[PDB]
Amino acid sequence: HWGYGKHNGPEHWHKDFPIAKGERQSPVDIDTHTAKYDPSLKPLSVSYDQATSLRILNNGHAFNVEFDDSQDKAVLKGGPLDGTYRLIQFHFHWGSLDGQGSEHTVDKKKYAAELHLVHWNTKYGDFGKAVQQPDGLAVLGIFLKVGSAKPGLQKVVDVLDSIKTKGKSADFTNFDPRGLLPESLDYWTYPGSLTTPPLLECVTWIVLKEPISVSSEQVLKFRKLNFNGEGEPEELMVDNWRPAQPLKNRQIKASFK
Numbered sequence: 635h636w637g638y639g640k641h642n643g644p645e646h647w648h649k650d651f652p653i654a655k656g657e658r659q660s661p662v663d664i665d666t667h668t669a670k671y672d673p674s675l676k677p678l679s680v681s682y683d684q685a686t687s688l689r690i691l692n693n694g695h696a697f698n699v700e701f702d703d704s705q706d707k708a709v710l711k712g713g714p715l716d717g718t719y720r721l722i723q724f725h726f727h728w729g730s731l732d733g734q735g736s737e738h739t740v741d742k743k744k745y746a747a748e749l750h751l752v753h754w755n756t757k758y759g760d761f762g763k764a765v766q767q768p769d770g771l772a773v774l775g776i777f778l779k780v781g782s783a784k785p786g787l788q789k790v791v792d793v794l795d796s797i798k799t800k801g802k803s804a805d806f807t808n809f810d811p812r813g814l815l816p817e818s819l820d821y822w823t824y825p826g827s828l829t830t831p832p833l834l835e836c837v838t839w840i841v842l843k844e845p846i847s848v849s850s851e852q853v854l855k856f857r858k859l860n861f862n863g864e865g866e867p868e869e870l871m872v873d874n875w876r877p878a879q880p881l882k883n884r885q886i887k888a889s890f891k
């Protein structure tokens with residue numbers, strides 16, 4: 635099945651998921667010179683004061699921090715979005731080296747990692763029905779650069795020892811995703827897809843311009859996770875990013891001058 639190695643990596647995905655070569659795949663390179671300011675964009679509203687985290691899971695491709703999405707508790711709206719999208723989980727993509735790791739790139743620049751806060755459109759009732767719709771998801775993407783530690787990341791980094799291998803999960807309550815946000819909510823937005831199989835084309839991407847800084851020690855701990863299950867040969871969970879895909883007939887809009 636799919637993964638990020640030589641024989642099952644991104645160049646192979648299209649055989650099981652032909653949408654891999656579809657018309658609105660993600661990620662893409664954001665050419666900042668070509669991304670037009672759109673003064674009709676509303677400010678983004680990120681309302682995470684009532685977020686209820688539940689659990690963290692190593693799913694063999696990344697780790698997901700999961701939220702109770704059974705009530706309107708942590709929602710994204712405004713910006714490019716019509717209506718209300720509810721937070722369901724966040725995860726990251728990262729590199730074996732600080733010079734790569736992000737999925738989106740900015741004028742071909744790769745960041746060390748990229749955080750994806752995944753939300754589903756509440757008009758669709760739940761996640762599973764939302765991913766059958768072309769406007770079912772909104773993913774807020776945030777770049778990570780290596781420098782100063784991100785204090786708000788440390789509770790995630792500290793729990794990783796307990797979910798080293800595929801299939802492991804751990805209780806992960808009372809985690810506040812507000813601590814992962816940069817100061818500015820200036821963003822680029824375009825229509826795309828999940829960046830992992832099934833690669834569904836349901837996503838309004840909202841990618842923040844301002845990265846957060848994490849320490850070298852924080853990212854090194856991400857790289858000690860494993861793609862394999864317990865009792866299998868160790869394969870470090872690194873380079874779980876898909877490269878940039880063709881922009882095709884899409885425009886990237888900027889929320890800022």
Ligand SMILES: Cc1ccc(=S)n(O)c1
Nearest residue numbers: 750752773827828829830
């Ligand atoms: C389930 C899910 C949703 C969004 C993304 S970017 N990934 O990678 C996975």
Ligand SMILES: [Zn+2]
Nearest residue numbers: 725727750829
């Ligand atoms: Zn992702």
